[PDB]
Curated annotation (Swiss-Prot):
Belongs to the AfsR/DnrI/RedD regulatory family. Phosphorylated by AfsK. Residues 1-97 bind DNA. The N-terminal and the C-terminal regions are independently capable of directing actinorhodin production. This is Regulatory protein AfsR. Global regulatory protein for secondary metabolite formation. The gene is afsR. It comes from Streptomyces coelicolor (strain ATCC BAA-471 / A3(2) / M145).
Length: 254
DNA sequence: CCGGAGCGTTCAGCGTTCGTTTATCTCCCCCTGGCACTGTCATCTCCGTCAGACCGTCGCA
């Protein structure tokens, strides 16, 4: 609320895509219109051609006379948005005139970069606040209810990036000494994510430093059984190494 | 000792919202046509290969 500048236009892509003019929300429109807006936004104001926009929205099988569909989608964007924010260059469209902090993806990138810089500088409270601000950006699943293979690719990429953000965040939480909340939320996540090995290693190191051991090795046994049932292979050697060093009761982690 | 209520799932009435087209309205690109004092023949090449042949050409005999 402290950065609510007058005349500032804010866009939301990390969840359901939305447009905010000075605090009031705009009617984005149809799901394909929303996906076109997302495709034009994530390129950081780079000119995307109409054929590439068609490929991003629809993929391999477009209808024959539906370039005018993208034309009227862009016209509806220019209706909803400013006349000058969306510019037409070389037959394509680009969302220009965006100030800093306008796009939530760029804000997340800057927050992650600042968190990494503070990790390099060793500042725990500052990077903790930066990651707290970062996690308060996306609401629910990214790109909710939009079609297209580009939308699917962005969805899975940003979900994976959020997974690594949670991994780094909670590894730092185990570094600073936050046991209870970490154990609870990682139990919830591994209930949601059954085959994510990194989060389960985080559960192992968290429970080893929290005074709880039985459910830790129970989760580990379930992990090996499910990984053998669904894949037929052996888990990563780092998980076995950390479990072995847990078994010998090494006081370095404690 | 079935009976009712609450709960789970599954479909037919109309009610709104999308997906994909269509003709009209600005802005730009691109091609053909107009210019009415008179003004009516450019242009520098090319040299210190080179080595002799092959060949047709050509005027003298």
């Amino acid at each position: 609320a402290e950065e609510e500048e007058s005349g500032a236009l804010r866009f939301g892509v990390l969840g359901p895509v939305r447009a905010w003019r000075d605090g009031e929300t705009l009617a984005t429109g149809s799901p394909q219109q929303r996906a076109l807006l997302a495709a034009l936004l994530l390129r950081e104001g780079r000119t995307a051609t109409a054929g590439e926009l068609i490929d991003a929205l629809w993929g391999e099988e477009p209808p024959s006379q539906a370039l005018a569909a993208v034309r009227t989608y862009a016209s509806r964007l220019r209706k909803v948005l400013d006349p000058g924010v969306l510019v037409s260059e070389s037959g394509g469209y680009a969302v220009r005139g965006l100030a800093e902090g306008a796009l939530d993806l760029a804000r997340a990138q800057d927050l992650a970069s600042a968190a990494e810089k503070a990790r390099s500088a060793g500042d725990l409270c500052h990077a903790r606040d930066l990651l707290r601000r970062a996690l308060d950006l996306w609401d629910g699943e990214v790109l909710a209810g939009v079609p297209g293979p580009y939308a699917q690719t962005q969805r899975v990429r940003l979900g994976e990036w959020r997974l690594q953000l949670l991994e780094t965040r909670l590894d730092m939480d185990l570094d600073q000494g936050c046991h209870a909340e970490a154990v609870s939320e990682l139990t919830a996540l591994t209930a949601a994510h059954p085959l994510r090995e990194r989060l389960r290693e985080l559960l192992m190191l968290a429970l080893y430093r929290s005074g709880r051991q039985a459910e830790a090795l129970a989760v580990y046994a379930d992990t090996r059984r499910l990984l053998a049932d669904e894949l037929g292979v052996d888990p990563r050697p780092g998980l076995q190494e950390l479990q072995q060093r847990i078994l010998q009761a090494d006081p370095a982690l404690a």
